[PDB]
Amino acid sequence: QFNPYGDNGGTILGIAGEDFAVLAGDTRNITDYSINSRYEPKVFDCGDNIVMSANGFAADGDALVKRFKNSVKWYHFDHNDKKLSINSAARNIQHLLYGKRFFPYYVHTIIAGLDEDGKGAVYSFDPVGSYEREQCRAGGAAASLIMPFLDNQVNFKNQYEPGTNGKVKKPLKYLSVEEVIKLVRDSFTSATERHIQVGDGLEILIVTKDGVRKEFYELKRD
């Protein structure tokens, strides 16, 4: 029987600062035990200061990103070049996904940018459109390796104030872009060590009120 889905591996990661947000993902693309490409980017600038990644089955991911990019274009045409806010983008993507509820896009989706007060924002979606705003989210093959690390190092979960008798929590606070990138780089190298589908290269898109910047780092190629 024809199976209309496949699995292209990779893993992605979004983090939100006070006045920035990063969306990262590895550049390896796989099927089964073969490497298709060591550099196939899956994190895209969609305009209006929104970056997006749809990870899992790449055909579905590309189709979604294409449709959303197109949705931005028409939003301008129909609403007098109004800037599409990240919250509005998120809701639009829900309808894109849920519209194929009974033949889903096999992707975990993450978008990042700034909310309307200029604060860093990350939204993540399940394959059929359930979405949630978060400070922190990993998606894809190594989500399960990276996510609890982020709970610990980004939201300081399970960390208490020394000498307080486990009574006072380590206090929540925003991270600098420099710290956030260290956590991303360490997240992906750790994931690369222990997950066969993760490797080759790491491409990060950083988003501030000044636009979208990129950074790229090599990963282990085995």
Partner 1 sequence: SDPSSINGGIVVAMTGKDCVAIACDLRLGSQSLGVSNKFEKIFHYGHVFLGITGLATDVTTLNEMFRYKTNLYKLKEERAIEPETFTQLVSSSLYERRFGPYFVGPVVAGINSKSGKPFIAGFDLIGCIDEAKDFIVSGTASDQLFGMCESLYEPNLEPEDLFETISQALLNAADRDALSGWGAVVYIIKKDEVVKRYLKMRQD
Partner 2 sequence: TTIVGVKFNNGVVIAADTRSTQGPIVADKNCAKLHRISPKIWCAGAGTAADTEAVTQLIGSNIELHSLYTSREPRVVSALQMLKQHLFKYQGHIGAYLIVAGVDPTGSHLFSIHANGSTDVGYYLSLGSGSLAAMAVLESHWKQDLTKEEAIKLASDAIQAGIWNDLGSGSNVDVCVMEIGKDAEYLRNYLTPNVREEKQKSYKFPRGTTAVLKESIVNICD
Partner 3 sequence: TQQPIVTGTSVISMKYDNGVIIAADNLGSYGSLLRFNGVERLIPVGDNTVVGISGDISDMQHIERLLKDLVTENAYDNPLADAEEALEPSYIFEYLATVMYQRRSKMNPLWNAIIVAGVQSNGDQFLRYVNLLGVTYSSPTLATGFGAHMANPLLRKVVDRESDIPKTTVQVAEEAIVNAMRVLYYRDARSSRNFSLAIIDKNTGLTFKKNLQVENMKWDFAKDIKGYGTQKI
Which residues in this chain contact partner 1 in the complex, by CB under 8 A?
Answer: 142, 144-149, 151-152, 157-159, 166, 186-187, 190-191, 193-194
Contact partner, 187, from partner 3, partner 1, Mg ion, none, Cβ < 5-8 Å per class: partner 1
Q: Is 173 in the site for partner 2 (CB under 8 A)?
A: no
Q: Which amino acid is at 200?
A: D
- Least distance in angstroms from the C-beta of 162 to partner 2: 3
# residues near partner 2 by CB under 8 A: 32
DSSP annotation of 176? P
- Least distance in angstroms from the C-beta of 133 to partner 2: 27
- Considering only residues 193 through 222, tell me which ones interact with Mg ion, judged by CB under 5 A: 222
CA dihedral 126, 131, 132, 136 (to 10 degrees): 40
133 DSSP β-pair partners: 123
Residues that bind partner 3 (CB under 8 A): 1-2, 4-6, 8, 29, 31, 34-40, 57-59, 62-63, 103
CB 203 within 8 A of CB 43: yes
Query: 132 or 193: whose CB is closer to partner 2?
Result: 193
Order the strands of the 43-45 sheet from edge to edge. Answer: 43-45, 51-56, 107-114, 120-125, 131-134
Question: Which residue from 103, 194, 209, 211 is in contact with partner 2, where contact means CB under 8 A?
Answer: 194
- Considering only residues 99 through 158, tell me which ones interact with partner 2, judged by CB under 8 A: 141, 153, 158
CA angle 200, 147, 105 (to 5 degrees): 75
Give just the sign of the alpha carbon dihedral 79, 108, 59, 45: positive
Query: 141 or 175: whose CB is closer to partner 3?
Result: 141
Sorted by sequence, the CB contacts under 8 Å of residue 133 that are 6+ apart come out as 87, 90, 121, 122, 123
Could you tell me the two tokens for 203? 């491409």
Using CB under 8 A, list all residues that contact partner 2: 9, 30, 32-35, 141, 153, 158-166, 170, 181-183, 185-186, 189, 193-197, 220-222
